[PDB]
Scaffold this active site. Structure first.
Site, PDB file in Angstrom:
ATOM      1  N   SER A 115       9.521  10.385 -19.187  1.00  0.00           N
ATOM      2  CA  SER A 115      10.023  10.469 -17.772  1.00  0.00           C
ATOM      3  C   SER A 115      10.190  11.949 -17.297  1.00  0.00           C
ATOM      4  CB  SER A 115      11.245   9.622 -17.587  1.00  0.00           C
ATOM      5  OG  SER A 115      11.344   9.229 -16.212  1.00  0.00           O
ATOM      6  N   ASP A 139       5.860   6.668 -20.397  1.00  0.00           N
ATOM      7  CA  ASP A 139       6.179   5.840 -19.220  1.00  0.00           C
ATOM      8  C   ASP A 139       6.438   6.688 -17.970  1.00  0.00           C
ATOM      9  OD1 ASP A 139       6.221   2.932 -18.870  1.00  0.00           O
ATOM     10  OD2 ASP A 139       8.257   3.195 -18.075  1.00  0.00           O
ATOM     11  N   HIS A 270      11.211   1.152 -20.148  1.00  0.00           N
ATOM     12  CA  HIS A 270      10.888   2.540 -19.753  1.00  0.00           C
ATOM     13  C   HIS A 270      11.107   3.480 -20.944  1.00  0.00           C
ATOM     14  CE1 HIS A 270      10.365   5.858 -17.123  1.00  0.00           C
ATOM     15  NE2 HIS A 270      11.652   6.197 -17.037  1.00  0.00           N
TER      16      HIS A 270
HETATM   17 CL   LIG Z   1      13.881  10.708 -15.494  1.00  0.00          CL
END
Ligand SMILES: [Cl-]
Length: 290
Positions: A115, A139, A270
């Site tokens: 992320s 992800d 995630h």
């Molecule tokens: Cl993030």
């Protein structure tokens, strides 16, 4: 608690399904950046966690992979300095990190970022090529985090006007919040995550180690960086994560000079390193070719 930050590593070895002596690990610091250095002073891989995480998110993966590694605390997270301007943009993160990584991990070809960490890695690869041989994005793409930043903006605005940082009567109350957000996940794994991501105040209350992110930053510039990078990019998606779309993945393929493909990890959200670390170890091991 009195518990040292390395006291739960046996739990990480069991989650990774590995046995034998734990690897050597210590905390390092250069100014504004704290990191965990695994396996001695010559890291092969750099790991960058997500928003609201810290370096310990990688413990299971690093213990399972068995390679020397540097897991960095992003600005505003873990033991790394906060910024009063609440800004943990990939671009700003990269500017702070590059000289530290040149000092602490000059020979690590591979960067794994989840992320916010993954977009930080893109900016590093662009500004400091000689360093980054190979990127693994967990992800995320520039477009995917931009869409998340746009959904959360009203509430990052409203929180910004509380100036309270929050306090918590107990450890359990932070654990109750984390259970509420992921109730299907093993509570000993959740408890370990909260332990690393929190600390006890002298007044007996508990607080998060991370700074509310009032703000992220720049993405047109970040796609220009993808257009310019020569480091090959691997993407890892969570099969149960909607964060990254098929169109996101195709956009990344079209802009990257060398996209190696997406690995889709069944029954991961995630945070692939939290939900399916064993499957992530095998993919990272494959990229190392080792
Ligand atoms: Cl993030």
């Amino acid at each position: 608690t009195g518990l040292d930050e390395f006291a739960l590593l046996a739990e990480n070895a069991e989650q990774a399904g590995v046995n034998g002596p734990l690897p050597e690990v210590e905390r390092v610091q250069a100014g504004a950046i704290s990191a965990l250095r695994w396996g001695g002073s010559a890291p092969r891989v750099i790991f960058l966690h997500g928003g609201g995480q810290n370096a310990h998110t990688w413990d299971t993966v690093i213990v399972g992979l068995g390679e020397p590694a540097l897991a960095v605390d992003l600005p505003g997270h873990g033991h790394s300095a906060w910024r009063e301007d609440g800004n943990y943009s990939p671009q700003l993160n990269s500017e702070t990190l590059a000289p530290v990584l040149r000092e602490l991990a000059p020979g690590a070809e591979f960067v794994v970022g989840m992320s916010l960490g993954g977009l930080t890695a893109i900016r590093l690869a662009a500004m400091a090529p000689d360093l980054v041989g190979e990127l693994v994005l967990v992800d995320v793409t520039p477009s995917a985090l931009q869409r998340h930043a746009e959904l959360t903006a009203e509430q990052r605005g409203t929180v910004a006007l509380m100036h309270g940082e929050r306090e918590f009567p107990s450890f359990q109350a932070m654990l109750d919040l984390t259970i509420a957000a992921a109730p299907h996940r093993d509570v000993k794994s959740l408890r370990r995550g909260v332990f690393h991501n929190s600390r006890r105040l002298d007044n007996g209350n508990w607080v998060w180690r991370y700074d509310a992110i009032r703000t992220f930053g720049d993405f047109a510039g970040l796609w220009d960086d993808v257009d310019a990078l020569s480091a090959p990019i691997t993407l890892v998606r969570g099969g149960s994560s909607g964060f990254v779309t098929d169109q996101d993945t195709a956009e990344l393929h079209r802009r990257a000079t060398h996209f190696r493909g997406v690995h889709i990890v069944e029954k991961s959200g995630h945070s692939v390193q939290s939900d399916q670390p064993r499957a992530l170890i095998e993919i990272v091991r494959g990229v190392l070719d080792t």
